[PDB]
Amino acid sequence: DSRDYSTELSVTVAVGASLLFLNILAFAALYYK
Amino acid sequence: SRLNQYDLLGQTVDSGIVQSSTGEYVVMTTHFHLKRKIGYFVIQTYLPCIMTVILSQVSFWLNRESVPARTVFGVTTVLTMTTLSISARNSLPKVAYATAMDWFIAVCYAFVFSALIEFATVNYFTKRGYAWDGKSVVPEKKKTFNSVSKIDRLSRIAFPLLFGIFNLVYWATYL
Amino acid sequence: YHEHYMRNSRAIGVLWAIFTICFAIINVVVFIQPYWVGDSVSTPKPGYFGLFHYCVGSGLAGRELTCRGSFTDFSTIPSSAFKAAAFFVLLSMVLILGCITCFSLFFFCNTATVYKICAWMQLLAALCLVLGCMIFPDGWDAETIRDMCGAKTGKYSLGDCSVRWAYILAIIGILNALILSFLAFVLGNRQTD
Amino acid sequence: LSRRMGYFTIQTYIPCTLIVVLSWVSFWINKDAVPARTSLGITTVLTMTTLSTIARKSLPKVSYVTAMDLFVSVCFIFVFSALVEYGTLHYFVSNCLDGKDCASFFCCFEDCHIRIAKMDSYARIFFPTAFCLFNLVYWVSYLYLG
Amino acid sequence: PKIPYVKAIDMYLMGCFVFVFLALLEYAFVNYIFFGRGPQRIKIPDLTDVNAIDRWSRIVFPFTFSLFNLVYWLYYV
Ligand SMILES: CCCCCCCC/C=C\CCCCCCCC(=O)O[C@H](COC(=O)CCCCCCCCCCCCCCC)COP(=O)(O)OC[C@@H](O)CO
Ligand SMILES: CCCCCCCC/C=C\CCCCCCCC(=O)O[C@H](COC(=O)CCCCCCCCCCCCCCC)COP(=O)(O)OC[C@@H](O)CO
Ligand SMILES: CCCCCCCC(=O)OC[C@H](COP(=O)(O)O[C@@H]1[C@H](O)[C@H](O)[C@@H](OP(=O)(O)O)[C@H](OP(=O)(O)O)[C@H]1O)OC(=O)CCCCCCC
Ligand SMILES: CCCCCCCCCCCC(=O)OC[C@H](COP(=O)([O-])O)OC(=O)CCCCCCCCCCC
Ligand SMILES: CC(C)CCC[C@@H](C)[C@H]1CC[C@H]2[C@@H]3CC=C4C[C@@H](O)CC[C@]4(C)[C@H]3CC[C@]12C
Ligand SMILES: CCCCCCCCCCCCCCCC(=O)O
Ligand SMILES: CCCCCCCCCCCCCCCC(=O)O
Ligand SMILES: CCCCCCCCCCCCCCCC(=O)O
Numbered sequence: 001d002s003r004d005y006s007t008e009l010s011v012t013v014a015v016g017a018s019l020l021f022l023n024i025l026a027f028a029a030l031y032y033k
Numbered sequence: 034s035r036l037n038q039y040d041l042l043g044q045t046v047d048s049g050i051v052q053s054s055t056g057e058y059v060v061m062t063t064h065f066h067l068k069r070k071i072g073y074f075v076i077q078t079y080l081p082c083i084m085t086v087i088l089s090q091v092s093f094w095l096n097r098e099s100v101p102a103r104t105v106f107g108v109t110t111v112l113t114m115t116t117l118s119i120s121a122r123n124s125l126p127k128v129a130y131a132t133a134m135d136w137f138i139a140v141c142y143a144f145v146f147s148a149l150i151e152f153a154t155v156n157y158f159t160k161r162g163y164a165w166d167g168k169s170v171v172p173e174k175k176k177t178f179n180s181v182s183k184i185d186r187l188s189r190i191a192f193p194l195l196f197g198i199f200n201l202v203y204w205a206t207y208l
Numbered sequence: 209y210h211e212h213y214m215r216n217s218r219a220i221g222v223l224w225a226i227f228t229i230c231f232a233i234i235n236v237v238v239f240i241q242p243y244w245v246g247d248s249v250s251t252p253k254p255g256y257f258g259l260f261h262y263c264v265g266s267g268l269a270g271r272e273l274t275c276r277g278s279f280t281d282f283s284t285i286p287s288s289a290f291k292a293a294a295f296f297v298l299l300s301m302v303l304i305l306g307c308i309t310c311f312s313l314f315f316f317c318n319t320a321t322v323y324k325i326c327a328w329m330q331l332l333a334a335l336c337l338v339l340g341c342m343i344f345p346d347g348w349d350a351e352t353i354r355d356m357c358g359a360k361t362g363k364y365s366l367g368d369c370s371v372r373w374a375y376i377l378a379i380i381g382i383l384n385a386l387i388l389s390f391l392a393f394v395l396g397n398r399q400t401d
Numbered sequence: 402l403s404r405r406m407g408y409f410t411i412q413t414y415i416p417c418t419l420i421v422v423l424s425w426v427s428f429w430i431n432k433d434a435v436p437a438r439t440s441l442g443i444t445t446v447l448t449m450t451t452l453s454t455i456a457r458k459s460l461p462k463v464s465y466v467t468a469m470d471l472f473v474s475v476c477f478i479f480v481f482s483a484l485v486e487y488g489t490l491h492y493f494v495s496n497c498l499d500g501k502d503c504a505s506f507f508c509c510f511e512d513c514h515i516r517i518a519k520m521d522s523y524a525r526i527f528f529p530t531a532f533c534l535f536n537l538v539y540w541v542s543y544l545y546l547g
Numbered sequence: 548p549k550i551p552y553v554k555a556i557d558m559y560l561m562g563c564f565v566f567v568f569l570a571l572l573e574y575a576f577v578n579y580i581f582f583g584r585g586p587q588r589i590k591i592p593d594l595t596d597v598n599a600i601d602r603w604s605r606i607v608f609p610f611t612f613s614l615f616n617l618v619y620w621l622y623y624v
């Protein structure tokens with residue numbers, strides 16, 4: 001097996017970035033009076 | 034016959050050929066047919082479980098105001114069924130699949146649990162904390178008294194009927 | 209204007225609940241799955257290890273991954289730092305599941321106080337997750353970890369072994385937990401208005 | 402080899418779950434029914450103590466918690482918590498730029514305890530929610546993730 | 548010893564279990580008679596009076612248990 005972890009790391013970081021993006025959007029909804 | 038558990042019905046004698054990587058071999062075969070004795074498990078396991086279920090269902094015939102009494106029935110019958118289940122399973126070969134007696138005990142345990150839940154539902158709708166005093170007249174719809182719970186009246190028919198039909202189908206299936 | 213305010217409050221609260229559930233799933237996954245660290249091309253032996261569970265190869269040009277380590281057993285864990293990290297991550301799991309339970313309190317209790325309760329609970333869960341993530345590399349000096357990765361690996365030093373998806377997922381969980389806690393605080397205050 | 406779960410499902414998992422449910426039944430029993438609720442709680446605790454005996458009958462005396470041990474332990478804590486909940490309820494009933502400050506934007510030091518009379522209302526949904534969440538994490542963990 | 552068939556001791560234990568079970572049913576019957584049939588308003592006494600049922604049980608349960616003991620011991624000894 002090709003013992004390299006880039007696509008796995010890439011997709012995990014993509015999912016994490018999506019989650020944090022949605023949560024900062026939640027702050028954008030709140031803090032905007 | 035040195036058998037305590039079983040009864041030897043008979044024997045069947047035959048012959049055949051068995052294949053192997055080394056070759057074909059003649060095999061003389063006998064088959065002794067055995068039937069387990071049921072009376073011990075009836076007197077020891079099935080009957081006390083049935084009587085415990087009957088005791089659990091007996092709680093429906095008491096007045097709804099006897100909250101500690103009916104709670105004591107429910108939980109102590111649960112404990113008794115637990116003890117009976119553990120004892121019945123202890124004297125049995127340690128098989129990881131469920132046998133017929135396991136299913137019977139499970140259904141009885143569910144029936145006892147359901148009787149306790151039925152009492153809980155009945156007590157949730159009890160209004161007055163005092164039972165009928167005997168002397169005072171109850172005007173059918175202290176001055177006022179709680180009516181007999183229609184949940185109790187329905188359970189008095191439903192629970193024994195359900196247990197009876199379960200017993201009928203169980204014993205018809207396995208016997 | 210008030211109805212827009214209330215509808216946005218409701219929608220943002222629902223979204224905060226979904227993201228809380230997502231973070232709880234992340235916490236369970238990172239606690240269970242043993243892919244915090246992984247072998248490399250230059251590693252003496254193959255395999256991987258997480259907080260408590262570790263699998264290592266026999267070393268005969270195959271997998272034959274012998275596996276050992278369960279959190280229920282406090283001895284198979286390679287080092288005390290690993291034990292502390294596993295305990296902290298478990299406590300974070302318990303805290304976040306406790307907030308998901310406290311979602312039930314929304315029926316009766318005032319919305320602000322329950323929002324603050326999950327806010328503090330998620331902040332504490334994030335603090336526990338940070339403590340676990342900081343304490344976990346301390347245990348890389350363990351003789352089993354050294355035997356896997358090599359002699360160069362040590363305290364706070366990856367060496368040949370490389371971090372796999374679970375570690376970065378835990379860091380993402382840390383960030384997510386902090387921001388969810390702040391979101392809960394501001395939501396609880398914005399209900400009061 | 403893979404073990405079969407039919408006997409364990411029938412014998413200890415389902416009965417332990419049912420005993421936990423019967424412990425929850427105390428929350429719907431009316432307050433001031435002190436003997437009933439106390440008897441229910443303590444006898445459910447006794448029944449869990451009885452049930453926990455058969456958890457390790459098959460196994461050797463290993464010094465780590467198995468999945469069965471964990472399930473039984475958590476159910477025991479659940480019934481213990483129900484009884485302690487009723488005890489607490491009975492005792493307390495018988496007798497700079499973000500928005501404001503670090504006491505009103507956090508710790509609720511404005512009134513808060515006061516509302517203890519509604520502890521049964523909380524426990525009616527809190528206890529089933531906690532047990533259902535525990536079962537979801539418990540069963541998903543031991544079957545799919547690992 | 549595990550010897551699965553019915554024995555004298557098994558019969559005695561079953562008999563005693565039946566007696567305690569019957570006593571519990573007797574109380575249940577008394578309770579239903581007082582509280583169930585009430586609001587609608589040795590030779591067995593009338594069912595109406597709960598004290599009559601209790602006195603009948605007081606007389607009869609020891610007598611029936613003694614009869615069971617006599618039959619058991621004479622049949623087995
Ligand atoms: C209080 C009033 C006084 C009551 C006094 C009675 C006291 C209690 C009864 C009996 C005690 C006698 C000792 C028990 C002895 C066991 C009974 C017995 O011997 O018959 C067995 C029948 O099994 C069987 O049909 C299995 C069935 C067992 C009986 C129970 C089935 C019906 C239960 C329905 C549920 C209703 C719920 C109520 C809801 C209202 C086998 O025999 P059989 O020759 O074939 O040999 C077969 C060979 O394998 C060795 O037995
Ligand atoms: C797989 C894991 C399974 C997860 C399952 C978790 C389930 C956990 C158990 C119960 C949740 C209970 C939620 C109940 C929410 C109901 C809240 C409600 O009734 O509406 C109002 C809005 O509240 C609010 O904005 C608070 C919003 C609460 C949001 C939480 C519920 C969302 C659950 C959506 C499920 C998504 C699943 C997706 C997973 C992939 C508040 O009322 P109210 O003004 O009258 O009071 C004011 C006071 O005077 C008296 O209460
Ligand atoms: C597991 C949870 C399940 C939840 C089940 C939920 C089932 C459920 O909701 O029950 C409601 C009802 C309550 O039963 P219940 O006997 O307690 O009825 C009340 C009781 O009689 C009170 O005494 C009455 O007041 P009072 O004495 O005169 O002062 C009151 O009338 P009122 O005050 O209005 O005048 C009555 O309402 O009974 C059914 O209809 C169910 C029949 C089917 C039962 C089927 C049983 C097998
Ligand atoms: C064997 C399983 C049986 C399950 C039967 C569940 C039936 C419960 C129906 C709830 C009825 C209801 O809403 O009224 C009770 C209280 C209302 O508050 P209160 O004024 O009556 O004190 O309502 C509440 O405040 C909380 C009610 C409970 C909601 C959670 C029920 C979860 C039950 C699942 C158990 C496994
Ligand atoms: C009370 C409510 C809100 C939270 C309950 C927390 C539950 C889900 C926690 C408490 C203890 C935890 C367990 C502790 C140890 C182990 C052993 C490990 O090898 C697999 C995970 C497993 C089996 C955990 C699964 C989740 C768990 C059961
Ligand atoms: C885990 C639950 C245990 C069993 C609890 C049973 C009690 C049920 C009480 C609620 C019955 C439904 C009430 C309907 C609303 C009403 O009209 O009062
Ligand atoms: C050691 C724990 C025993 C279990 C006790 C359960 C019931 C405790 C009730 C609350 C106790 C704390 C209240 C203190 C107030 C006071 O001074 O009386
Ligand atoms: C209703 C509240 C209780 C919630 C928990 C329900 C799950 C009880 C566990 C029953 C044992 C299930 C066994 C699953 C494994 C299997 O059968 O293969």
Ligand SMILES: CCCCCCCCCC
Nearest residue numbers: 232233236534537538541
């Ligand atoms: C898809 C993997 C799910 C893992 C379990 C999630 C539990 C969420 C907390 C109840």
Ligand SMILES: CCCCCC
Nearest residue numbers: 143144147191192195
């Ligand atoms: C097995 C429980 C039956 C309940 C009928 C209402």
Ligand SMILES: CCCCCC
Nearest residue numbers: 147148150151154184
């Ligand atoms: C499962 C028990 C039901 C009781 C009658 C509502």
Ligand SMILES: [Cl-]
Nearest residue numbers: 277278279280
């Ligand atoms: Cl494990």
